[PDB]
Amino acid sequence: MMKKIDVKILDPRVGKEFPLPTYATSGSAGLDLRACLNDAVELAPGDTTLVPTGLAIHIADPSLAAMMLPRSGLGHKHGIVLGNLVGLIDSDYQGQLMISVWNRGQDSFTIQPGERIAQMIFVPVVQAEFNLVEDF
Amino acid sequence: MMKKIDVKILDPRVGKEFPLPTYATSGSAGLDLRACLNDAVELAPGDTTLVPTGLAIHIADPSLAAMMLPRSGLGHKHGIVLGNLVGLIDSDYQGQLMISVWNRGQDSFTIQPGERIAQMIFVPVVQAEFNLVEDF
Amino acid sequence: MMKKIDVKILDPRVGKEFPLPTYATSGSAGLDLRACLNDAVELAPGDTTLVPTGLAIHIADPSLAAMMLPRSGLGHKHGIVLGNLVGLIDSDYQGQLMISVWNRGQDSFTIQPGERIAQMIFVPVVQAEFNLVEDF
Numbered sequence A, B, C: 001m002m003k004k005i006d007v008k009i010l011d012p013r014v015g016k017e018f019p020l021p022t023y024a025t026s027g028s029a030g031l032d033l034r035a036c037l038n039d040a041v042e043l044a045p046g047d048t049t050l051v052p053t054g055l056a057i058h059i060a061d062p063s064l065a066a067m068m069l070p071r072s073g074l075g076h077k078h079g080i081v082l083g084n085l086v087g088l089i090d091s092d093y094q095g096q097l098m099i100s101v102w103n104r105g106q107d108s109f110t111i112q113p114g115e116r117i118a119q120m121i122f123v124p125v126v127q128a129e130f131n132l133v134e135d136f
């Protein structure tokens, strides 16, 4: 299913020094995001850091949200995951996408400028209207 | 999209001492949940604890589930996340919502009564009917 | 909502030594997955391991993805979660489902052959078509 999402580029390097995110295959559910850094960031085990993506999106439709997940190989093989585990991006959020990266493993790891470090999917969300009942 | 969800309050303090969860903005995808505690809980790095919310919901529609996620600022900035990473609440679950809180960081942190510590979103789920094939 | 998903069994023990995954209740959103191991795997605190499921699925519909989540009791009570926190399975992925299991807790834990260690849900995903704008 395709839905149009507005995106604004916040850093000159995006699209130039490294590309805008794209779905690898037609059956891909997540987009990879890349670290828009100036210099490489070394993470010792336990450290977390905030990495800019140089992008800002505006989903604008209230039935849709985006989730940021770890990448499997990096999570499982290298211990490089998200400090907030899963990031949730609301339809009305329009600031920069920032990635909390946490080193949950036992070896230092250096994030390279432009490396793909997390992935994003867009899911339908429903807003609950609570019906108070004293018992179900 | 709005769907009606039944909710039963399990503790007298909910709605009184602190409010029932609400969507901050019209374009919010998650509801914040608050710790329905009697006393503050100090978490040393590594500790996990189970926090009641004083609420029980009953989604009751089998095409819908709820997920409990960490809050970004607390996850990323303070290392306060969920012990089971992401909690999944089924449509037929009707017991109390309980939040596993884990201190994945390096400083002790005290959870205050009524503090917002996790967030919940409602997503559509599909139930798979498996078609056995010997090869795709 | 029911959607048909093709599944191919990769190990003789699946369906025989332990069953194919099923929804416990009609209102269940996730399927439990079981470790298709030969011998029990002991995990010391900090360790991660990759566990086969002996299964391969092919969602094949591009509006649908599957997520692998920790099980609550094991995550919260025993510190046994996923090394990549949340696993995302694309509609065109057709290789074995493998589970990164991480021991985030403080006690060694042994995974038994056939034990249920993670759960899977199928969610609708949307593929974003980015509309470049200089400002929102």
Ligand SMILES: O=c1ccn([C@H]2C[C@H](O)[C@@H](COP(=O)(O)OP(=O)(O)O)O2)c(=O)[nH]1
Pocket: A068, A084, A086, A087, A088, A089, A090, A093, A096, A097, A098, A099, A100, B070, B071, B072, B073, B074
């Ligand atoms: O990994 C993340 C998570 C969230 N956000 C943005 C989008 C979201 O709308 C806003 C607030 O996030 P939250 O999960 O509501 O947490 P908090 O209220 O603790 O800031 O920050 C990010 O850029 N990256």
Ligand SMILES: O=c1ccn([C@H]2C[C@H](O)[C@@H](COP(=O)(O)OP(=O)(O)O)O2)c(=O)[nH]1
Pocket: B068, B084, B086, B087, B088, B089, B090, B093, B096, B097, B098, B099, B100, C070, C071, C072, C073, C074
């Ligand atoms: O953070 C959580 C996760 C789950 N639950 C409830 C809802 C769910 O229906 C029930 C069982 O959870 P599960 O993920 O199926 O795990 P387990 O079978 O290991 O108890 O517990 C919570 O209250 N909080």
Ligand SMILES: O=c1ccn([C@H]2C[C@H](O)[C@@H](COP(=O)(O)OP(=O)(O)O)O2)c(=O)[nH]1
Pocket: A070, A071, A072, A073, A074, C068, C084, C086, C087, C088, C089, C090, C093, C096, C097, C098, C099, C100
């Ligand atoms: O827990 C997991 C996560 C993913 N996969 C499969 C499905 C997915 O299509 C493929 C690639 O996963 P990914 O999240 O894209 O990460 P990476 O590109 O780092 O391999 O591996 C698994 O078997 N188990």
